Write an enzyme that holds these catalytic residues in place. Structure first.
Site, PDB file in Angstrom:
ATOM      1  CD  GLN A  11      -5.125  10.990 -24.601  1.00 56.38           C
ATOM      2  OE1 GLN A  11      -4.106  11.579 -25.192  1.00 56.38           O
ATOM      3  NE2 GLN A  11      -5.501  11.132 -23.255  1.00 56.38           N
ATOM      4  CB  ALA A  12     -11.602  11.098 -25.937  1.00 64.25           C
ATOM      5  CB  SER A 140     -12.638  14.660 -27.187  1.00 65.41           C
ATOM      6  OG  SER A 140     -11.347  14.856 -28.014  1.00 65.41           O
ATOM      7  CB  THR A 179      -4.105  20.221 -19.868  1.00 61.43           C
ATOM      8  OG1 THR A 179      -3.993  19.080 -20.489  1.00 61.43           O
ATOM      9  CG2 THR A 179      -3.797  19.805 -18.135  1.00 61.43           C
ATOM     10  CG  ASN A 228     -12.216   6.278 -20.502  1.00 56.34           C
ATOM     11  OD1 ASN A 228     -12.810   7.250 -20.749  1.00 56.34           O
ATOM     12  ND2 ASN A 228     -11.080   6.212 -21.067  1.00 56.34           N
ATOM     13  CD  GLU A 254     -39.688  -0.749 -32.302  1.00 53.78           C
ATOM     14  OE1 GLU A 254     -39.851  -1.794 -32.719  1.00 53.78           O
ATOM     15  OE2 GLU A 254     -40.290  -0.516 -31.086  1.00 53.78           O
TER      16      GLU A 254
HETATM   17  N1  LIG Z   1     -13.737  10.807 -21.037  1.00 57.87           N
HETATM   18  C1  LIG Z   1     -12.507  10.819 -21.388  1.00 57.87           C
HETATM   19  N2  LIG Z   1     -12.110  12.027 -21.816  1.00 57.87           N
HETATM   20  C2  LIG Z   1     -11.150  12.180 -22.587  1.00 57.87           C
HETATM   21  C3  LIG Z   1      -9.925  10.920 -22.658  1.00 57.87           C
HETATM   22  N3  LIG Z   1      -8.820  11.285 -23.175  1.00 57.87           N
HETATM   23  C4  LIG Z   1      -8.889  12.868 -23.433  1.00 57.87           C
HETATM   24  N4  LIG Z   1     -10.091  13.042 -23.067  1.00 57.87           N
HETATM   25  C5  LIG Z   1     -10.708  14.465 -23.237  1.00 57.87           C
HETATM   26  O1  LIG Z   1     -10.456  14.910 -24.563  1.00 57.87           O
HETATM   27  C6  LIG Z   1     -10.373  16.341 -24.621  1.00 57.87           C
HETATM   28  C7  LIG Z   1      -9.002  16.542 -25.452  1.00 57.87           C
HETATM   29  O2  LIG Z   1      -9.084  15.839 -26.624  1.00 57.87           O
HETATM   30  P1  LIG Z   1      -8.172  14.595 -26.910  1.00 57.87           P
HETATM   31  O3  LIG Z   1      -8.803  13.502 -27.173  1.00 57.87           O
HETATM   32  O4  LIG Z   1      -7.062  14.147 -25.923  1.00 57.87           O
HETATM   33  O5  LIG Z   1      -7.282  14.981 -28.381  1.00 57.87           O
HETATM   34  P2  LIG Z   1      -7.151  14.271 -29.434  1.00 57.87           P
HETATM   35  O6  LIG Z   1      -8.467  13.702 -30.228  1.00 57.87           O
HETATM   36  O7  LIG Z   1      -6.362  12.945 -29.740  1.00 57.87           O
HETATM   37  O8  LIG Z   1      -6.608  15.383 -30.593  1.00 57.87           O
HETATM   38  P3  LIG Z   1      -5.242  15.954 -30.535  1.00 57.87           P
HETATM   39  O9  LIG Z   1      -5.264  17.368 -30.296  1.00 57.87           O
HETATM   40  O10 LIG Z   1      -4.519  15.808 -32.021  1.00 57.87           O
HETATM   41  O11 LIG Z   1      -4.392  15.278 -29.751  1.00 57.87           O
HETATM   42  C8  LIG Z   1     -10.017  16.698 -22.939  1.00 57.87           C
HETATM   43  O12 LIG Z   1     -11.442  17.415 -22.661  1.00 57.87           O
HETATM   44  C9  LIG Z   1      -9.864  15.579 -22.508  1.00 57.87           C
HETATM   45  O13 LIG Z   1     -10.512  15.581 -21.028  1.00 57.87           O
HETATM   46  C10 LIG Z   1     -10.407   9.697 -22.086  1.00 57.87           C
HETATM   47  O14 LIG Z   1      -9.680   8.674 -21.901  1.00 57.87           O
HETATM   48  N5  LIG Z   1     -11.774   9.674 -21.310  1.00 57.87           N
HETATM   49  C1  LIG Z   2      11.420  23.701 -24.272  1.00 53.57           C
HETATM   50  O1  LIG Z   2      10.179  24.431 -24.683  1.00 53.57           O
HETATM   51  C2  LIG Z   2       9.501  24.093 -23.550  1.00 53.57           C
HETATM   52  O2  LIG Z   2       9.464  23.136 -22.928  1.00 53.57           O
HETATM   53  N1  LIG Z   2       7.883  24.791 -23.905  1.00 53.57           N
HETATM   54  C3  LIG Z   2       6.876  24.377 -22.888  1.00 53.57           C
HETATM   55  N2  LIG Z   2       5.713  25.184 -22.815  1.00 53.57           N
HETATM   56  C4  LIG Z   2       4.981  24.384 -21.882  1.00 53.57           C
HETATM   57  C5  LIG Z   2       3.587  24.726 -21.334  1.00 53.57           C
HETATM   58  C6  LIG Z   2       3.162  24.116 -20.344  1.00 53.57           C
HETATM   59  C7  LIG Z   2       3.777  22.853 -19.569  1.00 53.57           C
HETATM   60  C8  LIG Z   2       3.518  22.293 -18.603  1.00 53.57           C
HETATM   61  O3  LIG Z   2       4.183  21.466 -18.064  1.00 53.57           O
HETATM   62  C9  LIG Z   2       1.812  22.222 -18.311  1.00 53.57           C
HETATM   63  C10 LIG Z   2       1.441  22.044 -16.717  1.00 53.57           C
HETATM   64  C11 LIG Z   2       0.205  22.068 -16.383  1.00 53.57           C
HETATM   65  C12 LIG Z   2      -0.474  22.074 -17.849  1.00 53.57           C
HETATM   66  S1  LIG Z   2       0.536  22.052 -18.846  1.00 53.57           S
HETATM   67  C13 LIG Z   2       5.239  22.912 -20.177  1.00 53.57           C
HETATM   68  C14 LIG Z   2       5.694  23.697 -21.331  1.00 53.57           C
HETATM   69  N3  LIG Z   2       7.022  23.443 -22.010  1.00 53.57           N
HETATM   70 MG   LIG Z   3      -4.197  13.291 -29.385  1.00 60.31          MG
END
Ligand SMILES: Nc1nc2c(ncn2[C@@H]2O[C@H](COP(=O)(O)OP(=O)(O)OP(=O)(O)O)[C@@H](O)[C@H]2O)c(=O)[nH]1
Ligand SMILES: COC(=O)Nc1nc2ccc(C(=O)c3cccs3)cc2[nH]1
Ligand SMILES: [Mg+2]
Ligand SMILES: Nc1nc2c(ncn2[C@@H]2O[C@H](COP(=O)(O)OP(=O)(O)O)[C@@H](O)[C@H]2O)c(=O)[nH]1
Ligand SMILES: [Ca+2]
Lengths: 440, 421, 67
Positions: A11-12, A140, A179, A228, A254
């Site tokens: 994603q990042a 990331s 998160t 970004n 360089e």
């Molecule tokens: N600067 C910046 N950081 C990002 C962005 N998207 C995600 N991050 C950072 O990336 C970290 C999470 O990794 P991701 O890139 O979202 O996860 P991923 O590479 O898709 O890997 P998965 O676990 O499979 O989803 C966190 O620390 C986020 O703050 C972005 O668009 N810009």
């Molecule tokens: C049906 O089972 C669940 O929804 N599992 C579940 N586990 C969870 C953990 C976190 C969160 C959530 O909404 C967050 C708020 C802030 C960071 S994660 C939501 C969740 N839902």
């Molecule tokens: Mg991802």
């Protein structure tokens, strides 16, 4: 020739890729459909922008880029976004199930299912290069794909492309916009695994970018969109020497000669100026001296650390816009006699300087003021090791209790990979300490 | 897409299950026919998580309704949104477990469980990329408790790499007179600790105490208890059903919430029962927990909180910082940044803003100690034990479940007493 | 000097090839170690579920030898 292929992972990596390629297009006058009016050589060319763009017979300018994610929703926005015509469908690769912030899934479980396809698509880009220079990998540290799959890809790229250069733009985890809780694990693992396969890596601390957006652009609560766009400007400043020409232009390779004294010491600290809002830039010119001096204000760094409490091994200034050597030299002379700048004793103290004449561009509806001149400093400082220290400590806290480790073991990993990765990081921190000790 | 397959078992499981589908159908803007009549495309963005698209214009809950007695089946079919459920997904016995865990797990349920799995398999194979299962049930009865945990064991056999989350309703003397319930709970917990990724401890004791003392409701009904449950379940699934800050499936959510495989029992909370500082203080308050535990009697391993409504994102960040600072002792130091927050623009129905709390706290041991106390007080006398040995169980299986839950308690105590140095 | 020139570029080739070789091997060994561990982990999980099925039929059998 001298083509560069960009690879955007997770994603990042992907979303920063969007920001960069949009910005590149604006800089080169490339339309969202790929057409470039000012380009008179149709279907090909050896211009400076051709390092990053290939050309079709229909006059489409296509990014030399692959986007990869183990989950489709982020890349899907690229497929349906403003610049969907820019990319060929085979440049955008997605799986169905992500790595769930788990390095093991990115590197092993889920990654191995798609790694061959990815290498094939990259191979198809390489085969169209007459003189491939190397790769640029965006990812990331904290993601499961950004960490796990990237290190898998870097390992495979070393096998398939020998010693061809590989550069990284790596997102260093910050709690303000994350998160996830297991990111210190993923960070230490990918850094250990990628260390031998990367020639140079530009770390971007999300907290540094977050602060800059808050303090300099007066953004109450920055989003990925805000971060970004700023990151893309720094990436643009760094790649500008590859994409533009000019007498006073100095190629990134360089600068690299100066930035990397030992293979493992390849993490430059980036500082960028000016970052200023439209409201504050009105009726306020930023001189060469002013923006140069801002490069030594730690609040403007891409990584949180204090170079004033470390030692320099290299200092590079990459200017763009209305800038001439005379003003640069004067600004530097002032700074050298007013700043806390101290080099190790085994390295010369001169600042290596580059100037691209084409001025910075801003994305429409962005937050950054359009300025006549900007500068990116790339320095090699022992202080960057502070970022390793903070991360390694968070790692230690959790690993002592083996928190979250069962998720990694369940996907096939062993505790021995953790301790081995951590020991490499300990040795890395010691390396940075050893290069700063005075000679005998 | 990202599918969740929903399963509701027993009486309690089916009625809180029906409540869940009512509340989220309302949020996603679909009526009991299954037709969309909303206003925002954000209601349909992730509609696929809990619904199958069917006949022209129609959305059908990916839900499977299970019970050993046909009674509750008609109740759901007769209840609101009864005509939205897929008829074939109704799987019922004639038997009736009669609050006997053994009947649910080994005898009556074991005979019915195959036709249940048949419906599971049909829903699952139609899935683009199944992210996991969720089960609504109680642990005090016989069907939802005994057959529910049997179903979990069977599903994990065919889907060992899928996420299994439960919303488990915990038995309380304040709500149910049934004497044998601490047996059924202890037997079920013995299963849940091994075979689930997340268990939301919906404690009837806490639900009662909230309705009574906070909501000022003398002699609260099941409808009163379940209104809290539906509001909570709506909250904990908000990030899955609406596009927001989180790009997180069930696995990623579990990964960042469950530091140890056995310690996956969450105490949920809701607020209110308003300024952001007020919301935040309440959700960390012991009175607002759906599990009868005091968080200040233990430490948080991990915390997730979801704010809903249009509010200042900056203020949420600051108040969360403030709470952790003023309550630093109650978060374990050896897990950095273990408190995470998300915000959804779309508020629940009736509230212009709210907050759902998910806590992984060592103080949940208090709940398991309560059950263990009531359990052990029966097992000394072997009271009503012949209802279980009758079905073929041995007293040892009772001793093992007792000690396994004892181990669980001591394990929560271990990490509560752990320090960084 | 000519022979030294040849030995230098031969060394450069030998090192690059050795780096590629060892990377290929170490990776293949890692994927193989991971594949084994994950399979053993899942195998252990299923075997546990299989004792519970064995236990469940000894329970139902015990109930018929009860009458
Ligand atoms: N600067 C910046 N950081 C990002 C962005 N998207 C995600 N991050 C950072 O990336 C970290 C999470 O990794 P991701 O890139 O979202 O996860 P991923 O590479 O898709 O890997 P998965 O676990 O499979 O989803 C966190 O620390 C986020 O703050 C972005 O668009 N810009
Ligand atoms: C049906 O089972 C669940 O929804 N599992 C579940 N586990 C969870 C953990 C976190 C969160 C959530 O909404 C967050 C708020 C802030 C960071 S994660 C939501 C969740 N839902
Ligand atoms: Mg991802
Ligand atoms: N909160 C809540 N608890 C319930 C409900 N129905 C039953 N219970 C509880 O569930 C336990 C009995 O389980 P029950 O569902 O009747 O068993 P089963 O139908 O045989 O699986 C008792 O402790 C009840 O207090 C309900 O609608 N809401
Ligand atoms: Ca051309």
């Amino acid at each position: 020739m001298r083509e560069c292929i960009s690879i955007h992972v997770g994603q990042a990596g992907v979303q920063i890729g969007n920001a960069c390629w949009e910005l590149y297009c604006l800089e080169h006058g490339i339309q969202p459909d790929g057409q470039m009016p000012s380009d008179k050589t149709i279907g090909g060319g050896d211009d400076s922008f051709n390092t990053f763009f290939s050309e079709t017979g229909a006059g489409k300018h296509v990014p030399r880029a692959v986007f990869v994610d183990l989950e489709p929703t982020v890349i899907d926005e690229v497929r349906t976004g403003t610049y969907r015509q820019l990319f060929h469908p085979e440049q955008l690769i997605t799986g169905k199930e992500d790595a769930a912030n788990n390095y093991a899934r990115g590197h092993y479980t889920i990654g191995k299912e798609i790694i061959d396809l990815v290498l094939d698509r990259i191979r198809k880009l390489a085969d169209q290069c007459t003189g491939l220079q190397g790769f640029l990998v965006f990812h990331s540290f904290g993601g499961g794909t950004g960490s796990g799959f990237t290190s898998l890809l870097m390992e495979r790229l070393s096998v398939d492309y020998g010693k061809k250069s590989k550069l990284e733009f790596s997102i260093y985890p910050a709690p303000q916009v994350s998160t996830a809780v297991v990111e210190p694990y993923n960070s230490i693992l990918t850094t250990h695994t990628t260390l031998e396969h990367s020639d140079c890596a530009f770390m971007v601390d999300n907290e540094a970018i977050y602060d800059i957006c808050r303090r300099n652009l007066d953004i109450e609560r920055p989003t990925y969109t805000n971060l970004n766009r700023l990151i893309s400007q720094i990436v643009s400043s760094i790649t500008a020497s590859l994409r533009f020409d000019g007498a006073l232009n100095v190629d990134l390779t360089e600068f690299q000669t100066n930035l990397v004294p030992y293979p493992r010491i390849h993490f430059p600290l980036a500082t960028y100026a000016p970052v200023i809002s439209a409201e504050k830039a009105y009726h306020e010119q930023l001189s060469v001296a002013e923006i140069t001096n801002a490069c030594f204000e730690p609040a403007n760094q891409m990584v949180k650390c204090d170079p004033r409490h470390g030692k320099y091994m290299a200092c590079c200034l990459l200017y763009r816009g209305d800038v001439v050597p005379k003003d640069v030299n004067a600004a530097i002379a002032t700074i050298k006699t007013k700043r806390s700048i101290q080099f190790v004793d085994w390295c010369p103290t001169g600042f290596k300087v580059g100037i691209n004449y084409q001025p910075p561009t801003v994305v429409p509806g962005g937050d950054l003021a359009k300025v006549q001149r900007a500068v990116c400093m790339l320095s090699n400082t022992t202080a960057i090791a502070e970022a390793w220290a903070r991360l390694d400590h968070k790692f230690d806290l959790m690993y002592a209790k083996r928190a979250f480790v069962h998720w990694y073991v369940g996907e096939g990993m062993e505790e021995g990979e953790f301790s081995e990765a951590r020991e490499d990081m300990a040795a890395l921190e010691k390396d940075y300490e050893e290069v700063g000790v005075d000679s005998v | 897409m990202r599918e969740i397959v929903h399963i509701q078992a027993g009486q309690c499981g089916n009625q809180i299950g029906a409540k869940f589908w009512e509340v989220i159908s309302d949020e996603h803007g679909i009526d009991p026919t299954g037709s969309y009549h909303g206003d925002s495309d954000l209601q349909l963005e992730r509609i696929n998580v809990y619904y199958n698209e069917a006949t022209g214009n129609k959305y059908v809950p990916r839900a499977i309704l299970v019970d050993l007695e046909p009674g509750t089946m008609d109740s759901v079919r007769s209840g609101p949104f009864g005509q939205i459920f897929r008829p074939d997904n109704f799987v019922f016995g004639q038997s009736g477990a009669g609050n006997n865990w053994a009947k649910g797990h080994y005898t009556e349920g074991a005979e019915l469980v195959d036709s249940v799995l048949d419906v599971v398999r049909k829903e699952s194979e139609s899935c683009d990329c199944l992210q996991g299962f969720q089960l609504t049930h109680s642990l005090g009865g016989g069907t939802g408790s005994g057959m529910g945990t049997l179903l979990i064991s069977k599903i994990r056999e065919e889907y060992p790499d899928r996420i299994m989350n439960t919303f488990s309703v915990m038995p309380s003397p304040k709500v149910s007179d049934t004497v044998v319930e601490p047996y059924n709970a202890t037997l079920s917990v013995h299963q849940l600790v091994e075979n689930t990724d997340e268990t939301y401890c919906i404690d009837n004791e806490a639900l009662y105490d909230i309705c009574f003392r906070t909501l000022k409701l003398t002699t609260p009904t099941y409808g009163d208890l379940n209104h809290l449950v539906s509001a909570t379940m709506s909250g904990v699934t908000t990030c899955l059903r609406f596009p927001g800050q989180l790009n997180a499936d069930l696995r990623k959510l579990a990964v960042n919430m469950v530091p140890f495989p056995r310690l996956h029992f969450f105490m949920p909370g809701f607020a209110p029962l308003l300024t952001v500082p007020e919301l935040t203080q309440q959700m960390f308050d012991s009175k607002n927990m759906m599990a009868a535990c005091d968080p200040r009697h233990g430490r948080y391993l991990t915390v997730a909180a979801i704010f809903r409504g249009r509010m200042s994102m900056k203020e949420v960040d600051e108040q969360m910082l403030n709470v952790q600072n003023k309550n630093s002792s109650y978060f374990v130091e050896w897990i950095p940044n273990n408190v995470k927050t998300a915000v959804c623009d779309i508020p629940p129905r009736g509230l212009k803003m709210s907050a759902t709390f998910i806590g992984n706290s060592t103080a949940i041991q208090e709940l398991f100690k309560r059950i263990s106390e009531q359990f052990t007080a029966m097992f000394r006398r072997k009271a009503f034990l012949h209802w279980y040995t009758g079905e073929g169980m041995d007293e040892m299986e009772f001793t093992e479940a007792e000690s396994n839950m004892n181990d669980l308690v001591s394990e929560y105590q271990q990490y509560q007493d752990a320090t960084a140095d | 000097k000519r022979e030294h020139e040849r030995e230098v570029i031969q060394k450069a080739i030998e090192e690059n090839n050795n780096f590629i070789k060892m990377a290929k091997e170490k990776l293949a060994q890692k994927m193989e170690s991971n594949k084994e561990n994950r399979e053993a982990h899942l195998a252990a999980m299923l075997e546990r579920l299989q004792e519970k099925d064995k236990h469940a039929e000894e329970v139902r059998k015990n109930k018929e030898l009860k009458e």
